[PDB]
Symmetry: D4
């Protein structure tokens, strides 16, 4: 499995608004396209106002395919338009599970 850990830095104070809007308008579309949500968090220490998500993919090739499916989805584009102004900065990294890592 290929694991992606994405971090968004949000405008101060906007985490609860973002998470509510995402759950109502973005989660079903994004999880439907990408396939395996492993975790979706907000920070309590370090930089505040971060939302951190982990996604599992069969391969980099499949991640590419699923991300393009999501990016072209008209309902996703609408949600990105409504939620995007809360996002100040985005980063991502690719991780490999150790053999004993769960699931």
């Amino acid at each position: 499995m290929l694991v992606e850990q994405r971090t968004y830095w949000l405008k101060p104070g906007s985490v609860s608004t973002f998470l509510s809007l995402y759950e109502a308008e973005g989660l079903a579309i994004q999880a439907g396209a990408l396939g395996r949500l492993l975790g979706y968090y907000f920070s309590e220490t370090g930089d505040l106002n971060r939302v951190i998500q982990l996604w599992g993919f069969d391969s980099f090739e499949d991640r590419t395919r699923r991300k393009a499916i999501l990016s072209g989805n008209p309902q996703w584009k609408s949600f990105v338009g409504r939620a995007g102004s809360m996002i100040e900065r985005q980063s991502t990294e690719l991780l490999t599970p150790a053999p004993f890592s769960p699931v």
Copy 2:
């Protein structure tokens, strides 16, 4: 649930040695004491030679209790002695799951 994400930066080239030694000598003790391993990874992008672990705790109080149980374990101390020289730097952060985050 309270989620802890810990990062260790290891000496260059030492990730596979660390993961093999940990699986053989540290995993059963640490998972037994701490309770819920959510993920154990090594990095493929960004800073290389990172190992990243996520642990789930019922509360901060229980994390404190379980960490002291682990730190006082004589077999854990032995493993830390054998593996510790590979660790150059350590960081950790506390995270809260969004309501829709899995498990």
Copy 3:
């Protein structure tokens, strides 16, 4: 005791405005809810325009309780609305006093 050190990065030039507004409208509410202010500073070196605060808590559980009391306070919400635009970024960390640390 559990010690929290919070840092806010403010818009350039806004420190004195923030501190005056906080002292007049936020301090009594926040200190009343959280309990033990250990220090409230602004930076003279490093990143300028930082305000740095240290708070002492009996436990993480009590910090959680007191923070929710503060966040739900209608007068606090009003102050956050008036002061919040000065805040560009927020971070926090948890610290433990050494046995010989004062108070």
Copy 4:
């Protein structure tokens, strides 16, 4: 008052050894020379293996005077020789208390 916040990054695993050695051999000398210890902590989040100290001075001039008194103390030099190998990196910053900050 002028407040100094110093951070030392220690070798992984060495915090308890450093704090024990400092309390036994360095604290009385350093506090005697510098005058007002405001806090002495170790980190629980963020970079682990940090020790963080806050000192209060009447003025920068007096800080300079007291630091030179400490640096020239033969017993301090001995302690620095015994404890210094645990220190990997050091940083410091100067802070000013807000008018309502305690003490």
Copy 5:
């Protein structure tokens, strides 16, 4: 050869808009003035929303000459006016090829 690696951090979501506008209105002018484009990329990991460019110059003196030619070009100024609002931050570094580096 002197190699310059420039990084622009763009507003979230704006990479494809920037690259399309640059290719249509800026590339021919900039490549014409500067001389040797070695690579023009956007990031897939790390900080997202980065565009990274590498340029090769005969010398620092020639880089200075060509950059002033570009900066004074009225069509370049127009493009910078239309594209500039997408750029949040800029950095650059100078690199020297190893003897075996290609071209």
Copy 6:
């Protein structure tokens, strides 16, 4: 001598506008109040859009006195109002000359 090195990060593209406005409206006032300008630069590598200034002071006490004189100057306040929107972030550090450092 006590040396202060200040860095301002400016809005992309604004360095020449800032330097022209400062030279016309701020330099004589600021240099008159602070006393010894050692250098005033803009960056060519690293973070672009930085302006970096070095000031020499007889002592920290005199720096404090001169900075308050400048901050209270009505013409300085006017210039800060006109130039301030170009400044995104500010940092500063204190340095000590080596014995052989010039002047």
Copy 7:
């Protein structure tokens, strides 16, 4: 094409030794396994003692295949043993060429 940009931070002063040893003992093996070297540089500004390499791959899957071929090569392992002590830290990132990027 998928582009990888790798950075190694070397022990101060060791860049020329590393590059000479690599050219003599590592380049033919590594380029033979990985396929397309796009650039191999050392830094002149920013962090000194960096070596920066860019590699082009048909796909992430092919990068994975070629990296495992290289890692299992006995002559590569020997070179890594002889050169590795110069490497203090390693990072990498994945990049996508813009449509107009050369080659």
Copy 8:
């Protein structure tokens, strides 16, 4: 004029030893080769154990020429051998003086 600002991070506690050794064995050679020392400092805030130097050059081409003269000097090589172990990390940046910057 082209200005170079170099920073060395030294082993904790070694600044005074480095500066004494440099003044006795390196300064005359280095200043003789490079031409115009503008400042040589150690840090009092921020990262401690930094030495920061500013050098002025007629041009980048002349900086290149003078640096190669210095690097090939047998007495410089000897000094670098004796002082080099104190240096943990090195960085540099190029700066341009504003028109009103002194000298």
